[PDB]
Amino acid sequence: MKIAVFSPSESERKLVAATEKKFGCELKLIDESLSAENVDQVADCDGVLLKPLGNLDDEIVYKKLADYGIKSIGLRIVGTNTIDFDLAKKYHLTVTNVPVYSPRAIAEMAVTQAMYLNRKIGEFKANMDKGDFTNPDSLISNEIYNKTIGLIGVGHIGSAVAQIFSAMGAKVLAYDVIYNPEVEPYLTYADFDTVLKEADIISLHTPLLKSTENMIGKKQFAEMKNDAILINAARGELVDTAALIEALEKHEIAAAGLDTLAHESSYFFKKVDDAQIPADYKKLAAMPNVIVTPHSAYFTKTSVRNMIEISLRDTIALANGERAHFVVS
Amino acid sequence: MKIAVFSPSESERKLVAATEKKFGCELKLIDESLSAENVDQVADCDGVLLKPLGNLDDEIVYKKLADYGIKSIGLRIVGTNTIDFDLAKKYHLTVTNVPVYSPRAIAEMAVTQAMYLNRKIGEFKANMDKGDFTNPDSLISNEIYNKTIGLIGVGHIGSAVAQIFSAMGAKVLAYDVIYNPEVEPYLTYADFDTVLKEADIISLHTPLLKSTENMIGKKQFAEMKNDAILINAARGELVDTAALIEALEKHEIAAAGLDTLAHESSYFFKKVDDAQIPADYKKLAAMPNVIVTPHSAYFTKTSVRNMIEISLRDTIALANGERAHFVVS
Amino acid sequence: MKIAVFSPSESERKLVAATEKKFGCELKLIDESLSAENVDQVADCDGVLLKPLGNLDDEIVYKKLADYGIKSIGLRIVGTNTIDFDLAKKYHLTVTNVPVYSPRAIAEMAVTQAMYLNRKIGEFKANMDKGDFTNPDSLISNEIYNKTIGLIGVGHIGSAVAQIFSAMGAKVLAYDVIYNPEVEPYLTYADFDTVLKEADIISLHTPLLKSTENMIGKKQFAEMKNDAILINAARGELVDTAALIEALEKHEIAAAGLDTLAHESSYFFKKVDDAQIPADYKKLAAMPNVIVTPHSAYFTKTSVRNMIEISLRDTIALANGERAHFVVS
Amino acid sequence: MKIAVFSPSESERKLVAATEKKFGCELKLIDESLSAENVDQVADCDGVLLKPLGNLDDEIVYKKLADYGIKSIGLRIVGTNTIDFDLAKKYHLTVTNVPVYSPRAIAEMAVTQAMYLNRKIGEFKANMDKGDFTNPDSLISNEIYNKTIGLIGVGHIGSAVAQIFSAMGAKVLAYDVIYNPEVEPYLTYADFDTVLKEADIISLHTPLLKSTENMIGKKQFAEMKNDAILINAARGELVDTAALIEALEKHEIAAAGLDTLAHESSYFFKKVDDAQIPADYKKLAAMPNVIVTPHSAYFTKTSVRNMIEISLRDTIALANGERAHFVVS
User: Which residues contact D72 (CB under 8 A, 6 or more apart)?
Assistant: First the structure.
């Protein structure tokens, strides 16, 4: 049982030994992701784990996989769009994926950003950098249990946000289109308008769909409380960035924590020069009441381990024609 | 019922009218701290609420409060250092204070700082500032339910830190010299050495005393885990700053969140020029794995209100010959 | 939109008005469940909600449903075995069901029974009934945070058990065959032997399968700690009752809370004479360290509401050829 | 180091050896309470630990402890009623006690009883006893996150009740005459009338004083919701038992859990005959929606140990001229 691993990250490499032992298999790590140019390297292998940078679009790959007895495409991510299903069907190559990495990883980054912004630590730092070490009333804070949290969408990640906040004593409201009895201990469902008007901290947990692009814009910011804090660890495209920047500069909201931004593809996950960084990011990055992280909410030891292990399990099951949890086909 | 209030903060001013209505009393605000210069303004006053900047040394102030029928001194703060208790006894002046502003205010600042540093948000920022938007392993994080929290001292604040951390699923250990059965659902008592050795996040909750000054020094940093996060929202002098800086520079700890620092008195609560700010602060402030705040863990609406309303309440009571909750030796 | 409701319970009747308003439909409640004998009563109706006592086995029902334009069978329960799918397929009659009622309802009954049995309130009552009002050491208890909980199986219900207990400070271990990252904050996975040897309170959350019938028997009881408490709110058939009774009489365990028993079908949900109640139940019912409830863990306002509302939603969607959440076909 | 222990419980006996090892002292156990009859057994003793059944009236006991160099009286209990404090001062005998055994022990008994009664387990039992195994609406229950908890008094115990209930998602309200900022994450202060009117579960945490005797009477039952559950694990005399019985009989409340009852002193902690048990108890004990326990909320391993080790520790300290934590007036 030798499984090829394409496009391993530094963090995934640290796990290979442990992983090999636990699964009784060998991992063959290959530095680039899978192309026509290096597929010839699964020959001595019984399966493939993928982290595709770019679309898997040219058929010499899909065919040559089947030539070697490969039956499955084990994506180490949720993201499916990089796989041309037409081809996969064409070579009885199942696709697996990793739908849930660690919902607490993302929930905890959201809560963390919200707390820091609530305590205005950045605004204190910007004051201090100018030699102002006072406690002006404009930097006063409050305990989390005096806050209302509002969730737009819930899911596994929102549910974990609600659990955390409600356990610190906060009131958590949520708009959603589906009803889940299991999250009732931790939040109260309410319609969208109420969530936006009443919440002191608002966090996005909606999927990106054409109906949700820009669902947070000028009109929503105007509805928000002026001291509200917006967090978006879901999808950059949910929020109109210019509307956001302006709302922050107008003080129609108080702060924002973003793990994701529209057009992040140009720069997130890369090294770049100054001329490569867009101007909206530079504006947000200069504000003491804004956090931007490079889509790293997921980035814990647990998520990294699960991405590797979940995908590997499905992928070995399928090598043994055994059944698999996260087929997508 | 009229109560003089000396030296109110800006945040304190803002609550005044609501407090009048709530207590059905009148608050006479004096901008400065009580002094021989302003004492005669107490003349039409039932009681006094003090926030002394500096020593209340002169005796004619005390003679004159006693002359005006004033039966106590209501410290709005915790520290009684500037009260010459000798003169107090001489003039039959009970002294009260506010020991417990809001333990949650402080505990939440500690947690917030720990979570931010755990997520290495500032290290991602320093990296992004140089155009690096990747997710290197050196910035991988972890879920809080995988961490051990170590408390040095508990008290009302540490106890609250322990409640919050254990409610997120963390394991919490605490060193203390008195036993409180009511904290055991949230922490496990342990030896001081065990705590430093096993904790991934250390938070300080120890009174500053002769015996506890530089309690956290070179030897203690050497004992901690190298990815440990040190939080001090108790008292700066508990920590040897030089040893802290060195430890961080050598990566013998991963991060530090300080709401208080040795020698902070020179610059905390002031506006100053660059030349007035000490070098140890400047070193800390430059580190992207450090947070420093200007002793603002307390600074929530609840605290500021409690500082007024708890003193006011004991102060009114003693004016009525009734009992105060927080009389002091 | 008129929906027939068969075999309504007293609790479901209390909801009709509210339900009708919220869904803009009329409910036609019919006292017995659906047979050949009363199916002629869906004529003026656009759908049917069912709570079948007994198998729906005779085709005159399935055919006459289609004759009236009925497209769906809306079960108000999880239980599917009462529907002959061969027939349903034969009349393009979809089957819906209600998979999740309220997991907290069942989790809370489990926790409640565990707590009462931990505090030995029944044993105190049996003492008191004989005139003994003392506090003998054999009736000493302990705080929940000094206990280890062990879950055999997890699921939605076990996950809610773990959440509750771990929030009171208990250590929760769990054996399961599937791995769910989202419950990690609340329990630690461990193998079956460890859960049985180490747990102070053990609660069953395994599905009944031929491989699980009697999975708790003489050998497991002997492995359990002598002061352990077994709770089973899952499926009566998971536990060998005679092995249980004997373990209780031998004091190889301390107590048991059962919401379900093998052969409960003879008596649960019915009114019966003494000669109709089996002897195993009478033995357990006479023990002060045993609770038996008549499979009522589910029985809250929320579960009753959800059973009605979830099934009704799917069933109206299907009347409008719209899509539905809980199809089983 | 030898410390005499008077009148140990059976549970206390069981810990003795471990306590010796833990304190590195010797414990001389005397079966009876201190009296002129047994005082001379203190002669070889450093200090004393008392559990007085009855008044310690004679003065020669006190003269003789003082004669034997004994510097304090270590009550292992909370109540100091049987200490003639006058004689204590005469003979320079500091008096200490144990105010805080384990607040969680008591709070957990309250919660446990509330949850059992909320789930109406005893009413299902009374029903099953008559062969009725149904789920009538009169026995429908509800999830604890849908309930409001009302506390009359807080303190260390009530506070713990509030932590547990709010961690299950309940809304908790409390009436009190002193403000504690540290409880606000878990409860909201409210007027006494609001609490009785809005609470679905009422739990008492008020000291028995002249002004609080029958604080819960006819008028207060009439104010409560008719499906209210009343819990008293504080002091029996707070509740007018006649009015309690009547209220239950009239279904003006749904249930009651009592760990303490007015006049309990006649039978609690004793073995007695049927003729010695009062009628009000017999009425309560017959109701399947009532629990009565014999003042055993405290009775966990933690409490029994703390009662020994906390007194022992202050007792050793005062023998060393060091400070005690729980000296008493």
Answer: D47, D48, D93, D94, D95, D96, D314, D315, D318, D319, D324
Closest-CA residue in chain B for A264? B133
- Using the Cβ of C143 and the Cβ atoms of chain B, whether some distance falls under 8 Å is answered with yes
CATH assignment at residue B16 = 3.40.50.720
Number of domains in chain B: 2
> By what technique were these coordinates determined?
X-ray
Q: Is the same domain home to B292 and B304? A: no
Interface of A with C in 48-107 (CB under 8 A): 100-104
Would you state the structure tokens that stand for residue D208, as one six-digit string? 């028995």
CA–CA gap between residue C148 and residue C165 (Å, rounded): 9
> Are B108 and A144 an interchain contact pair (Cβ–Cβ within 8 Å)?
yes
Look at residues B257, B191, B189, B244 and name the one whose alpha carbon lies nearest to residue B216. Answer: B244
Catalytic positions of A are: 235, 264, 295
Residues 6+ away with beta carbon under 8 Å from C231:
C110, C113, C114, C117, C201, C202, C203, C204, C256, C257, C258
Residue of C102, C159, C163 with shortest CB distance to A181: C102
How far A151 CA lies from chain D's nearest CA (Å)? 17
Resolution (A): 2.1
Q: How do beta strands A94-96 and A188-189 pair?
A: unpaired
CB C290 within 8 A of CB C256: yes
What is the C-alpha separation between B282 and B148, in angstroms, rounded?
30
DSSP string, D281-315: HHHHHT-TTEEE-SS-TT-BHHHHHHHHHHHHHHH
Do A182 and A75 belong together in one domain?
Answer: no
Report the SS3 class of residue B139.
Answer: helix
Burial string for C52-81 (b: 16+ CB within 10 Å, else e) reads beeebeeeebbebbeeeebbbbbbbbeeee
In terms of CA atoms, which chain B residue is nearest residue A106? Answer: B143
Domain that holds residue B223: 103-297
Structure-token pair, residue A311: 């995908």
Considering the domain architecture, whether residues A274 and A141 belong to the same structural domain is answered as yes
Among the listed residues B264, B305, B309, B322, the single catalytic one is B264
- Asked if C80 and C326 touch (Cβ cutoff 8 Å), the reply is no
Is C302 at the interface with chain A, CB within 8 A? yes
Distance of CA A221 to the CA centre of its chain: 23
Check D121 against C112: CB less than 8 A apart.
yes
Do A124 and A250 reside in the same domain of the chain?
Answer: yes
- Based on DSSP, count helices (H) and strands (E) in chain B, helices before strands: 11, 12
DSSP character for C295? Answer: S
- List, edge to edge, every strand of the sheet that includes C148-152: C188-189, C171-175, C148-152, C201-204, C229-232, C255-258, C290-292
Specify whether B280 is located in the same domain as B325. no
Least CB-CB distance to B135: which of A104, A277, A294?
A294
Min Cα distance B161 → chain D (Å) is: 12
Angle between helix C103-119 and D103-118 (nearest 10): 130
Summary count for chain A: helices (H), strands (E): 12, 12
- Both D89 and D177 in one domain: the answer is no
Residue type, B24: G
Beta-carbon separation of C167 and B167 below 8 A: yes
C-beta separation of C103 from D238 below 8 A: no
| Helix (H) / strand (E) containing C255 | strand C255-258
On whether both D178 and D271 belong to a single domain, the answer is yes
DSSP B107: H
Nearest chain A residue to C324 by CA: give it: A178
Distance CA D256, CA D220 (A): 14
Same domain, residue pair C287 and C328:
no
Helix axes C301-319, C16-23, angle to 10 degrees: 40
CB-CB contact of D195 with D222 (8 Å): no
| Residues of chain D contacting C137 with CB distance shorter than 8 Å | 9-11, 14
- Number of Cβ pairs < 8 A linking chain A and chain D: 19
